[PDB]
Amino acid sequence: VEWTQQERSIIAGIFANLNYEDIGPKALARCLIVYPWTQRYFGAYGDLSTPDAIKGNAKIAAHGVKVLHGLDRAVKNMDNINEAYSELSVLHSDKLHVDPDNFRILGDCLTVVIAANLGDAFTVETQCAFQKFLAVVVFALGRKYH
C-alpha cells in the first residue's frame, strides 16, 4: 500500500494518547456480544454467559488490551506490516486456530468503539485512513494461514 502523509499522521494520532485500558476491553467485549461465535476461543476466560458478565470480565478486558497493543507494531512499521505480522499470523493459525474472518469483525467493532470515543474528532478522512490501516493489518494477520 502507498500511504499519504495525512494517513500516517492520522494513524499516529489515534494511537499516541490512546487509552488502551478503555478502548481495548470495549472493542473485544462488544465483539463477543455482537458476534458471539467469537467466544469459541475464550473457554479458559471464565464467565461469558451474558453481556454484563462479558463487560465485567477482567480476563477478557486484559485480552482486549493485549490485542489492542497488538496494533502497535503496525503503527511503528507501516510500510512493512506484512513482515511485522508474519509471526503473529503463524500463531493465530497454527497454535490458536482463530478463524481470520474474526479479525475483520473485531476491526469493525474497534471502529465503532473509536467512533464513539472520538466524537467530532472522528472525521470522514479519519475513518478512511483507519479503515485502510485495519484492512492492511487484517490482511497481514491472514497471510500465513495454510
Partner: protein, 143 residues
C-alpha cells in the same frame, strides 16, 4: 436471520431516541460509505459531487433513512414491507446486495459517533440484525 421480540423492542427503543436525527445520520453514513468504500460511488455517477455534506449526499442520505424509518414501521414483516423498494433496487439501480452490508456498517459507525452512550453492545447487536434483515428484504426481488 429472524428478529426476536427482544431485537424488535430494542430497535424500536433506540429508534425512539435517534429518529429525530434520521436526516443527519443518513447524510453522514452515505458520505462515509462513499469516501471510505469508494467502490460504492459507482452507483452515484449521475450526481458527481459525492463530497461529505454535499447537496446530493444529504438528499440521498435522507432517502435512505426514510427507508430505514419505513423498515422500523414494517419490522414484523420486512419482506413484504420493503417489496417496492426491493423492486426499485433490483431493476432500476441494480445495486449489488454486497453494498447493503457496507452502508449498514457505516450507519452503525455514525449512530455510535452521534449517540455513544445509547449505542451499547446490546443495542448494537439488535440494530446490526435489523439492518441485515433490511438488506435481505431489499435483495428479495433481485432474482
Amino acid at each position: 436471520t429472524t428478529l426476536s421480540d427482544k431485537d424488535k423492542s430494542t430497535v424500536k427503543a433506540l429508534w425512539g431516541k435517534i429518529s429525530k436525527s434520521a436526516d443527519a445520520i443518513g447524510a453522514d453514513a452515505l458520505g462515509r460509505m462513499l469516501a471510505v468504500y469508494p467502490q460504492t460511488k459507482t452507483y452515484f455517477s449521475h450526481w458527481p459531487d459525492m463530497s461529505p455534506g454535499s447537496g446530493p449526499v444529504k438528499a440521498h442520505g435522507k432517502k435512505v433513512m426514510g427507508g430505514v424509518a419505513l423498515a422500523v414501521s414494517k419490522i414484523d414483516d420486512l419482506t413484504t414491507g420493503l417489496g417496492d423498494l426491493s423492486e426499485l433496487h433490483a431493476f432500476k439501480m441494480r445495486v449489488d446486495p454486497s453494498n447493503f452490508k457496507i452502508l449498514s456498517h457505516c450507519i452503525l459507525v455514525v449512530v455510535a459517533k452521534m449517540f455513544p452512550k445509547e449505542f451499547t453492545p446490546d443495542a448494537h447487536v439488535s440494530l446490526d440484525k435489523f439492518l441485515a434483515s433490511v438488506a435481505l428484504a431489499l435483495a428479495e426481488r433481485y432474482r
